[PDB]
Amino acid sequence: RSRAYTPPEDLQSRLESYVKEVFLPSNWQDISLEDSRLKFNLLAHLADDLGHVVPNSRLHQMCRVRDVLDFYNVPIQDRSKFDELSASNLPPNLKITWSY
Amino acid sequence: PYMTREQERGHAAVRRREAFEAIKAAATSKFPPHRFIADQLDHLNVTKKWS
Amino acid sequence: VKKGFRAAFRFQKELERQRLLRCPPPPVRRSEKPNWDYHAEIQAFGHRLQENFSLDLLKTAFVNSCYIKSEEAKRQQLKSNQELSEQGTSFSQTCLTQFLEDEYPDMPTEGIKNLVDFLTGEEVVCHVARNLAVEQLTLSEEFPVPPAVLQQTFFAVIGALLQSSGPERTALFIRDFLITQMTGKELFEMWKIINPMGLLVEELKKRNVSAPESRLTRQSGGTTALPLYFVGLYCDKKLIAEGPGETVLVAEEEAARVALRKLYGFTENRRPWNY
Amino acid sequence: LRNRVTDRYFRIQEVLKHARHFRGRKNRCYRLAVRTVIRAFVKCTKARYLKKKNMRTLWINRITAASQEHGLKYPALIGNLVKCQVELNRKVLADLAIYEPKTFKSLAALASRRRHEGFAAALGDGKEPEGIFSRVVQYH
Amino acid sequence: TARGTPSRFLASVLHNGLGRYVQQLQRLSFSVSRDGASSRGAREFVEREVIDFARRNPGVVIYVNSRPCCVPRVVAEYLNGAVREESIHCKSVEEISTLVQKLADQS
Amino acid sequence: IGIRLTLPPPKVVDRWNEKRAMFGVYDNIGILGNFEKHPKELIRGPIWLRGWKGNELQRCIRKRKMVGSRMFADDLHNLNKRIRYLYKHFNRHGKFR
Ligand SMILES: [Mg+2]
Incomplete structure (x- = not known):
């Protein structure tokens, strides 16, 4: 259970496969998620699979399948600032310590 | 003098009128400034921390 | 007993500073x-x-x-x-x-x-x-x-x-x-x-110039506790250097030093170092 | 006392670090040290005007002395160096007077030469050739 | 005032412009709280500006300590062994950048 | 030198006390409990200032008429003199009129 997310490379076909398995026509990226059961099944399958869930703050924002598609291909990367600074390719005269 | 008083009359009335319409216009265009969402929310950053 | 913490903290650190000025520790390496x-x-x-x-x-x-x-x-x-x-x-x-x-x-x-x-x-x-x-x-x-x-x-x-x-x-x-x-x-x-005088004498022998006559050029306050002399040093009745002093011997030695600076190019007016 | 003042050693000490070098009880007793410290700061700012003034009269004393060594007087030197478009100032002339007295002698020679051309020019009046050092460089 | 204060004459450290120019600033020591409202502008300075700064002059070695402080400081040390401790308490990133460049530029 | 030499004992504050954790609960008992109570019926204090705010002359008048009959003798007397003073102050002294 770690908030790091790295989007898959077969995400188009997986997501499309889930859209067919919840249903199916062409132009499937413009399917409205107005039906609430359809949205719950689609995002519940994706959360079960990818381990990455659409938050409550964004859950109303996807009204098409394309928006879920655009959500599941942002890399949410989670580590401490000590691990972000020390990995940002420091010059040889910066030294950072964490008295924590 | 370069002119008589009859010659100078109204030779600069337009520029004087425009100048005062500018003074008048800056006087009658006074109002409170716009208030923004970004400023009010930007006060939340006083408790921005590291992770 | 005044309630609060900030003045006691400031005062605590001023006491720390007077402790460091009264009895400073031996310097540790960096x-x-x-x-x-x-x-x-x-x-x-x-x-x-x-x-x-x-x-x-x-x-x-x-x-x-x-x-x-x-x-x-x-x-x-x-x-x-x-x-x-x-x-x-x-x-x-x-x-x-x-x-x-x-x-x-x-x-x-x-x-x-x-x-x-x-x-x-x-x-x-x-x-x-x-x-x-x-x-x-x-x-x-x-x-x-x-x-x-x-x-x-x-x-x-x-x-x-x-x-x-x-x-x-x-x-x-x-x-x-x-x-x-x-x-x-x-x-x-x-x-x-x-002994700059002997050194000046030897150097003038090496250029094949005669021994210089020390020769009192200017003076003031000769009979006081604050005299001033300028001794000159002539070679064939042309001076090479002249220097001041509180006594005559001091001024003569110093004129010898002026002459030695002038022979060696090490004057106060030399071309500065080109960096 | 609901809230009385805790941080008062430091207000006193803000004043008294400026008084540590006075005499008498002005160096220790805040009530006396305040009047003297205020009064010291007022002198300290009015003394900027007098620093500038006294430097300038010091320079005029040194230029006066050094130019009297060459027979000139001070108004003659300054006037007839302006008239040669040599716009050196008093600080530099006083420093040349002390540290470079051949440059100062040659400046006194340039100013007395210009002074004589002023005399000879304003004596033989009418259309004549101007003086050599009397010529000016026109800037456009 | 001038009679209360000490004075000195205008100098360099080792004739600092004659041969070559040497940056007189050896070490900076930032100390920045992780959670703490006073070292906010310090935090945004370490994240944005300190790496660029550390590259613009490599003769300066920079230590960011990041402990729980209640006032953040920078401690400039100089080649002649002087130490200037200045606070970056409740300063913006731009104000800290001008302060750090100020400490860099001087002796 | 009225400054203390040692720094005082630390002030340990429990932010997750019972009082602090439950502060503010039932301030909206009116607007989401069908208006059966007002929030001013939540406050506890003197009986003459539960859900009432006044300046000092009004606090004294209200205290005298609400509880003044069972006040102690020289407290009642001090309070009568305070109303008499504060009357003569608010009504006859000040800058603005
Ligand atoms: Mg003046």
Whole structure:
């Protein structure tokens, strides 16, 4: 259970496969998620699979399948600032310590 | 003098009128400034921390 | 008892400051205080001076022989410094004699030896190496770093710059740090002599000029506790130098010194060092 | 006392670090040290005007002395150096007077030469050739 | 005032412009609270500006300590062994950048 | 030198006390409990200032008429003199009129 997310490379076909398995026509990226059961099944399958869930703050924002598609291909990367600074390719005269 | 008083009359009335319409216009265009969402929310950053 | 915390904290730290001024602690070396990364700071010492070193070689330039011995005294409960310091002081002696033979061709070689033995003295080199952060990087036994040791490490750093990047860059290094130490200093503040009159006499024999007559040019307050004399020194009734003094002997010796500065090109008006 | 003042040693000490070098009780007793410290700061700012003034009269004393060594007087030197378009100022002329007295002697020679051309030019009046050092360089 | 204060003459450290120019600033020591409202502008300075600054002059070795402080400081140390401790307490990133460049530029 | 030499004992504050954790609960008992109570019926204090705010002359008048009959003798007397003083102050003294 770690908030790091790295989007898959077969995400188009997986997501499309889930859209067919919840249903199916062409132009499937413009399917409205107005039906609430359809949205719950689609995002519940994706959360079960990818381990990455659409938050409550964004859950109303996807009204098409394309928006879920655009959500599941942002890399949410989670580590401490000590691990972000020390990995940002420091010059040889910066030294950072964490008295924590 | 370069002119008589009859010659100078109204030779600069337009520029004087425009100048005062500018003074008048800056006087009658006074109002409170716009208030923004970004400023009010930007006060939340006083408790921005590291992770 | 006034409630609160902030005035008691401020007052607590002012008491700490008066404790540090009344009884200050003995100075600890810099590597035994917070914020020290030895490797990072050797690299910084390289980039600071605007040259490159082979870093291991500069690392051995800071490692003394006293430090290894007291370190192995501490083991029972490293290349030394001496090779690089030998090369560095040999080279800096010959390059200082190159510069000072080129820009002062009339000097006696006794004078060049005393100039070079000033610019590589303990006072000069220890004054330079405490402001280039050499002392902070010296691995020595005792603190503060004793002046013979620090002289040795400074010339070790010159030896490491020599093996790093050749004789020309070290020539510019020595030019920019040792030669600039003779700016604003008179010749006989560096090359001390006794009996300048005899020295001036011998030098005038070497140019095949006659012995100079010392000859009182100007004076004032002769019968007071504050006289002033200007003794001149003539050669075939043309003066070579004239100097003031509180007595006549003082002014004559000093006129001898003015003449010696004038023979050797080391006047106060000489063409400055071209950097 | 609901909230009385805790941080009062430091207000006093803000004043008294400026008084530590006075005499008498002005160096210790805040009530006396405040009047003297205020009064010291007022003098300290009005003394900027007098620093500038006294430097200038010091320079005029030194230029006066050094130019009297060459027979000139001070108005003659300054006037007839302006008239040569040598716009050196008093600080520099006083420093040349002390440290470079041959340059100062040659400036006194240039100013007395210009002074004589002023005399000879304003004596033989009418259309004549101007003086050599009397010529000016026109800037456009 | 001038009679209360000490004075000195205008100087360099080792004839600092004659031969070559040497940056007189050896170490900076930032100390920055992780959670703490006073070292906010310090935090945004370490994240944005300190790496660029550390590259623009490599003769300066920079230590960011990041302990729980209640006032953040920077401690400039100089080649002649002077130490200037200045606070970056409740300063913006731009104000800290001008302060750090101020400490860099001087001796 | 009225400044203390040692810094005082630390002030240990429990932010997750019972009082602090439950502060503010039932301030909206009116607007989401069908208006059966007002929030001013939540406050406890003197009986003459539960859900009432006044300046000092009004606090004294209200205290006298609400509880003054069972006040102690010289407290009642002090309070009568305070109303008499504060009367003569608010009504006859000040800058603005
Ligand atoms: Mg004036």
